[PDB]
Amino acid sequence: PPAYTNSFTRGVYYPDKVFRSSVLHSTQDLFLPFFSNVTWFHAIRFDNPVLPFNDGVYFASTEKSNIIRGWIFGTTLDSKTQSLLIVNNATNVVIKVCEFQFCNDPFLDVYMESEFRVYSSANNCTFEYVSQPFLMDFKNLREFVFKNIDGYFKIYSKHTPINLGRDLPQGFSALEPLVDLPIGINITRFQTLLALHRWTAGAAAYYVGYLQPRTFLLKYNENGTITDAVDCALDPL
C-alpha cells in the first residue's frame, strides 16, 4: 500500500555555477513542484521496489544509521545494456557504469563488506570514479536530486540537521551540486541499495518525488545563497 507526504518547499537546487548578489532570478528548469505529494517508502518485511525515473528524482532520507547505502540506475537492470551503480563505503563512493547482471533482490552484505549479492557480472565498464564523502557529509535529513541530461548525470545534495517533525520540515534549504558525470547512458529505472549485516535490518524510510519542468523565481541574498523561491504555477499570489 502507498503512503504519501506533503513536501512543502523542497528540492530547490542551484541551477548553475554562477554567483549572484541580492537578485531575484527567474529560471525555468526541472524542479520538484511546491506542496506536492512525495511517496514515503519504508522497505522494512524487506520490500524495496524498482521505480521509474521519467525526469530526475528527489530523494530524501532520515536515517541515523548507515542503511541507505547507494543506488542502482539503468534501463533494464540486466546485461546486454549498461547500467550505473553508486555504492557508498565507509570512506569513499565508487560510481561504476558497467553491464551488471543485477540480481532480483539486491543488497550489500556486511559482517568484511561484500558485493556478490548485488550482481553477478561486471563486463565492460567505461567509467570509474572515486570521491570521499557523498553521505553523512537530533536526526539529520539528507536530500539528493538526480537528473540525467545530455549524457551528463547530475547529483545535487544537501545534509541538514532538523528537529523532530514530519521528516520533511517546513523551511527552506537549497541543494548544492556534488558531481557531474559524463556517462552517456539512457536511464529510466532505478532502485536503492541496502545493507543487511548478515536477513535482519533496522528501519529504513525514504521519500521519493519526481521532477517536472517548472518556472521558479529564486531570491539570492548578499552572500549568494538562495533563501526563498516562488513556483510560478502554484497559486494566485
Partner 1 sequence: LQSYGFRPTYGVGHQPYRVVVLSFELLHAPATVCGPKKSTNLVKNKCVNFNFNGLTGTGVLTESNKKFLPFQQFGRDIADTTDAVRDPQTLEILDITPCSFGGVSVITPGTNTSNQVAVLYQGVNCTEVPSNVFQTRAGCLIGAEYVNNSYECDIPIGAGICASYQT
Partner 2 sequence: SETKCTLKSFTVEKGIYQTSNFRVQPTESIVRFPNITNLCPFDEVFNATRFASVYAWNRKRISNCVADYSVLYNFAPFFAFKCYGVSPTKLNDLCFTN
Ligand X SMILES: *[C@@H]1O[C@H](CO)[C@@H](O)[C@H](O)[C@H]1NC(C)=O
For binding to partner 1 (CB under 8 A), which residues are involved? Answer: 14, 17-21, 23, 150-152, 176-177, 182, 184, 223-225
Q: Is 3 helix (H, G, I), strand (E, B) or coil?
A: coil
Round to whole Å and give the CA distance between 25 and 20: 9
Closer residue to partner 1 in complex, CB, 18/237 = 18
> Least distance (Å) from partner 2 to the CB of residue 182?
7
Closer residue to ligand X in complex, CB, 34/139 = 34
Closer residue to partner 1 in complex, CB, 151/165 = 151
Closer residue to ligand X in complex, CB, 23/90 = 90
Say if residues 14 and 174 touch (Cβ distance below 8 Å). yes
Q: Using alpha carbons only, what angle is made at residue 101 by residues 200 and 60, rounded to the nearest 5 degrees?
A: 50
In the chain, residues preceding a discontinuity (C to N beyond 2.5 A) are 44, 111, 137, 198
> Least distance (Å) from partner 1 to the CB of residue 200?
40
Report the relative pairing of strands 206-209 and 212-220 from DSSP bridges. Answer: unpaired
Residues that bind ligand X (CB under 6 A): 4, 35-37, 89-92, 94, 113, 123-124, 186, 222-223
Q: Pick from partner 2, partner 1, ligand X, none: which does 20 bind, CB < 5 to 8 A by kind?
A: partner 1
